[PDB]
Amino acid sequence: DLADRFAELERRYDARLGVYVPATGTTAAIEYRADERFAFCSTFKAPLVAAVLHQNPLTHLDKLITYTSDDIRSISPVAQQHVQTGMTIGQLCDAAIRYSDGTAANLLLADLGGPGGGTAAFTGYLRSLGDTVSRLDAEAPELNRDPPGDERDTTTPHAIALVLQQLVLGNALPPDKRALLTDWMARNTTGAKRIRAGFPADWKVIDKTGTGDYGRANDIAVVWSPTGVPYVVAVMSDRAGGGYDAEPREALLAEAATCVAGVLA
Numbered sequence: 001d002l003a004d005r006f007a008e009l010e011r012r013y014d015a016r017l018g019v020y021v022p023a024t025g026t027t028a029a030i031e032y033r034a035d036e037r038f039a040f041c042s043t044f045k046a047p048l049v050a051a052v053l054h055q056n057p058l059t060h061l062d063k064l065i066t067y068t069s070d071d072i073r074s075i076s077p078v079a080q081q082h083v084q085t086g087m088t089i090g091q092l093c094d095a096a097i098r099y100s101d102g103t104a105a106n107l108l109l110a111d112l113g114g115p116g117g118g119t120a121a122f123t124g125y126l127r128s129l130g131d132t133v134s135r136l137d138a139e140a141p142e143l144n145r146d147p148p149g150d151e152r153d154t155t156t157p158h159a160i161a162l163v164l165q166q167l168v169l170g171n172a173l174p175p176d177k178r179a180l181l182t183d184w185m186a187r188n189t190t191g192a193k194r195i196r197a198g199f200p201a202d203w204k205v206i207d208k209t210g211t212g213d214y215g216r217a218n219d220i221a222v223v224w225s226p227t228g229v230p231y232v233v234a235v236m237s238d239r240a241g242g243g244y245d246a247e248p249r250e251a252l253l254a255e256a257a258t259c260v261a262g263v264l265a
Contacts, residue, residue: 041210074102102140144212198257215239215246
């Protein structure tokens with residue numbers, strides 16, 4: 001009937017919705033359209049940071065990166081205030097997650113595999129984590145703007161939840177780098193009205209958001225129960241049938257999170 005509850009959420013918001021909460025030692029897996037393709041949108045910036053953290057020592061986060069005002073080709077809340085000063089790799093990581101800064105992500109993509117193959121190196125990092133399905137084929141903001149059915153810049157709720165499972169709670173990152181990717185997500189400022197709004201206050205939530213064309217609204221997250229038990233929650237959605245300019249619905253993501261919270265609370 002929970003599958004019917006999500007199916008009712010789709011009818012109410014006239015949307016497609018995908019949910020995956022991986023099974024734990026004490027809870028079963030929640031899955032709804034978890035093997036269908038949804039666009040990454042900006043959700044890829046948390047594993048992007050992990051790729052950069054993984055491939056480089058911590059001192060690499062002190063490397064100063066300079067750029068121009070002509071590099072700002074997407075919504076970049078932080079990068080467009082520091083053109084004259086330049087931003088550090090850590091500062092780019094801090095901005096790519098907490099403010100979903102598109103230029104910061106585009107810079108970290110270039111840091112990953114050079115100017116041309118940042119998207120190809122990011123996909124390879126997902127291939128290194130056991131993701132055989134996810135692919136990134138453009139940088140911000142073009143990765144938000146593929147038509148429905150195009151596999152470019154898409155992952156699945158099942159895939160990204162397992163990747164984030166490895167990154168925050170698993171062994172994909174050394175614990176000191178793990179704590180850094182966790183801390184930045186813990187202070188994300190873009191997702192107060194998504195999964196965080198579907199969980200009660202005593203639950204701790206870290207997340208990274210995603211928004212795009214065709215009503216795309218996503219949110220991947222790890223939550224902690226008041227007793228400290230962790231869960232991965234990946235929620236993805238789009239309202240494709242309404243056109244490329246369909247309004248994303250953050251409420252659809254928090255109602256879906258409320259349904260999940262009812263299963264885990």
